[PDB]
């Protein structure tokens, strides 16, 4: 490897063999149907609302998220890169495609497959990823650099449907070798969306931009027709020329066949027929090609520019509904623009690098914090762009001054802003996009006073309830299969209008989004306002036995969704006490004087009552009535937590806090495997895991995480990091279950899990909160 001191990984990129084989993989624990797409992932491109593109560490381009809500993993095996060698005074080359894999079917049967073990490597560090390719029959070495403009307090490019691959190319060698790379792209119009005829009208066309000393060569791939649909629009593949390359083209070529029409060029010498032809296809699939060749000498280093863009303007929903995407705001609506998106990428890519590298550069210029919980911070955030992330331009059809926005849970529950998880999960938006963050808690606020009559059946116990009942705060904003933003409350497992900690949760998501954007949003806090105060006072009449407290009520009625509290919970109450003091607050800061002395005496009494009822000498008790309700849960002091990140000072004695957080440590981590993989749930006092659920004996991601921020800002520092480690270590360490990119809500103590691609363990940004 000599190509890797030419270019700039840092040292906490996660890293992988290309072509590795990883044995110790996790699978599904639950009964029912569950994705498992496998370990073979990678750092997604593609920008928020975008719909994004996962290219795994083997180089395909598998994990398909452009159907906004879906998850789609299959390999097109058409879309690649390959490369072409030749030594100077050789009789032949060799061309490569550098994917570790082979299709399934005869078609490209041509190409040459299999690129070998041994001979390069990934690395990720989000929103940046690599490939090396030093391989033994190619003396030229080569790396790519890819990524999409993700970038904090940036509402613009952070949307773009575009990555960039910046090649470098070097010759270590004492004799002259020819190269090329020729990136390849199937014409996916009709991949979804599209009923019948999925390919019929599919073309492709070539542009040139020559302006001043600058060209760039790109290949348009769209459809004859102007129906305004969610399959249709078109992608973009090219590149920008460079002082010492020429570029060749080819612009159709069959990817249902052997792929030989392009391939019998690319083999012979690295250079394409530039043949364009705009037939427009029937049933064949077809693709385009662009490549770039080059002499490297002795010693001599190229860097050479790639861009892929995807202009797919609507987004539809299974309830029918159509919405443009945030993207079209800067390149319009009509699903023509990719060669602009395109051009835009490649001409200004550089200073996307330096602004990710402005972002990125605090953290990692820190050397108090250990490399691997970089690697987590920065690897985790792939999420916001890989959760289905819907982001609204306007619905088809009919203009407001907002742009509503949804991040699903995950796929397997495919609900919008659940808002019990989020509780968790939107760290990253309120520190890094908060624009966003409080345009949902908007979206929650109006939400509030909706009363919908109509019943559905509740999956737990066959019962039929209110779908959403006036004053309590919904679970989510709907679901991709339904009508995000218009109806809520998707979810039916149990029924969110009798939770009792979702009114508190959303409460403490205001006050958090107000303190964490510098205090100064005094209009974000009136529009919330009633909504707060609606929220409190629907849950205190949730108060059975007048201890000023809701009562869990011998169900599964909050986030742990199949564990059953009763009476005061340590959860749930904590979170109440925290709510009410954050309401008293932003009753000084918005002059509401009566509405502080109300919460003000509801908090009092409630706290009183919690400590009497739960503090037990070393903890404070799961809750009042269960039939183990002694047991130690990682999430007992949730409200104290937010306290703490809201400086809302002690909700309960400082002392009790810190005797609780070392009991958690002592018993949740360190006799649950070791401490190597997080803090389970819930356990008996005699130290061994409460298993009267499934969820007590499980580790949530999410709240590992946090529970970690908890004790770093009481002083617990090494208890904090030890804790996270074993997230840090199932989801990215060889002695882990493969989970990269992947992170699930939760696992037990085998390793297998539940729900990949999960919201909750964003909550990683709250052990940053100084940012
Ligand atoms: O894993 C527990 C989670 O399951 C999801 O299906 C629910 O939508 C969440 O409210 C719950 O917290
Ligand atoms: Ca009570």
Redesign the pocket.
């Known amino acids: 490897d000599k190509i890797s001191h030419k270019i700039d990984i840092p040292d906490s990129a996660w890293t992988i063999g290309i072509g590795e084989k990883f044995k110790n993989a996790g699978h599904p624990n639950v009964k029912y149907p569950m994705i498992d797409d496998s370990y073979v992932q990678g750092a997604p491109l593609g920008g928020f609302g975008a719909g994004t593109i996962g290219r795994t560490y083997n180089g395909g381009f598998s994990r398909w998220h452009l159907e906004i809500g879906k998850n789609k993993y299959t390999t097109v095996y058409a879309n690649q890169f390959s490369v072409f060698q030749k030594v100077e005074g050789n009789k032949d080359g060799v061309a490569q495609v550098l994917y570790a894999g082979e299709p399934e079917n005869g078609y490209l049967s041509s190409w040459k497959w299999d690129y070998p073990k041994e001979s390069g490597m990934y690395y990720a560090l989000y929103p940046n990823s690599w490939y090396t390719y030093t391989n033994k029959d190619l003396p030229v070495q080569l790396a790519v650099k890819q990524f999409s403009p993700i970038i904090p307090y940036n509402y613009k490019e952070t949307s773009y449907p575009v990555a960039v691959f910046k090649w470098t190319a070097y010759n270590p060698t004492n004799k002259n070798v020819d190269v090329s790379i020729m990136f390849t792209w199937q014409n996916m119009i009709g991949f979804f969306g599209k009923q019948v005829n999925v390919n019929s009208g599919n073309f492709n066309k070539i542009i040139k931009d020559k302006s001043k000393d600058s060209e760039i060569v790109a290949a348009v791939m769209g459809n004859i027709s102007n129906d305004n649909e969610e399959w249709n629009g078109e992608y973009s593949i090219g590149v920008k020329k460079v002082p010492g390359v020429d570029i060749s083209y080819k612009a159709k070529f069959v990817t249902t066949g052997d792929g030989s029409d392009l391939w019998h060029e690319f083999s012979k010498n690295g250079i394409l027929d530039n043949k364009d032809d705009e037939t427009p296809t029937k049933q064949d699939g077809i693709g385009s090609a662009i490549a770039v060749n080059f002499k490297l000498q002795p010693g001599q280093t190229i860097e050479v520019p790639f861009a892929l863009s995807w202009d797919l303007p609507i987004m539809k929903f299974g309830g029918g509904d159509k919405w443009y995407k945030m993207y079209t705001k800067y390149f319009g609506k009509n699903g023509k623009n990719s060669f602009a998106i395109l051009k835009e990428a490649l001409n200004n890519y550089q200073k996307w690098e330096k602004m990710i590298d402005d972002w990125q550069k605090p953290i990692l210029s820190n050397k108090s914090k250990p490399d691997w919980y970089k690697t987590a911070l920065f690897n985790e955030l792939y999420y916001l762009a890989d959760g289905g992330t819907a982001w609204e331009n306007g619905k088809v059809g009919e203009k407001r001054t907002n742009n509503m926005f949804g991040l699903l849970?995950?796929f397997?529950?495919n609900?919008y802003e659940?808002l019990?998880?989020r509780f968790y999960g939107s760290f990253p938006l309120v520190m890094l996009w908060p624009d966003i963050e409080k345009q949902v808690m908007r979206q929650f606020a109006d939400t509030i006073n909706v009363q919908d009559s109509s019943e559905f059946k509740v999956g737990s116990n066959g019962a039929m309830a209110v779908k959403k009942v006036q004053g309590m705060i919904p679970?989510?904003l709907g679901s991709s299969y339904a009508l995000p933003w218009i109806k809520i409350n998707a979810?039916d497992?149990?029924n969110?209008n009798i939770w009792k900690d979702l009114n508190s949760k959303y409460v403490l998501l205001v006050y958090r989004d107000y303190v964490l954007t510098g205090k100064t949003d005094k209009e974000f806090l009136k529009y919330t306002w009633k909504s707060v105060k609606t929220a409190l006072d629907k849950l205190k009449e949730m108060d059975k036995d007048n201890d000023g407290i809701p009562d869990n009520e011998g169900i599964p009625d909050?986030?742990?969704?199949?564990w059953s509290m009763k009476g005061t919970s340590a959860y749930c109450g904590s979170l109440w006490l925290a709510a009410l003091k954050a309401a008293q607050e932003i009753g000084k800061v918005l002059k509401d004087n009566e509405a502080y002395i109300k919460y003000n005496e509801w908090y009092k009494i409630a706290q009183q009552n919690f400590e009497k009822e739960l503090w037990n000498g070393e903890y404070y008790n799961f809750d009042t009535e269960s039939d183990h309700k002694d047991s130690i849960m990682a999430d007992q002091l949730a409200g104290q937590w937010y306290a703490d990140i809201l400086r809302l000072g002690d909700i309960l004695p400082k002392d009790h806090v810190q005797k609780a957080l070392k009991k958690i440590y002592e018993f949740n981590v360190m006799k649950f495997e070791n401490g190597k993989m997080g803090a389970v749930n819930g356990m008996r006092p005699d130290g061994i895991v409460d298993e009267s659920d499934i969820?007590a004996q499980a580790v949530?991601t999410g709240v590992t995480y946090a529970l970690a921020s908890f004790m770093k800002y009481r002083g617990m520092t090494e208890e904090a990091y030890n804790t996270a480690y074993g997230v840090y270590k199932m989801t990215y360490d060889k002695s882990g279950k493969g989970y990269w990119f992947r992170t699930p809500?939760?696992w037990t103590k085998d390793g297998n899990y539940?729900?990949s691609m999960?919201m909750?363990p964003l909550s990683i940004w709250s052990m940053e909160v100084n940012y």
């Open positions: 849970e995950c397997d529950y609900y659940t019990d998880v679970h989510d979810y497992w149990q969110p909050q986030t742990y969704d199949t969820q949530w809500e939760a539940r729900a999960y909750r």
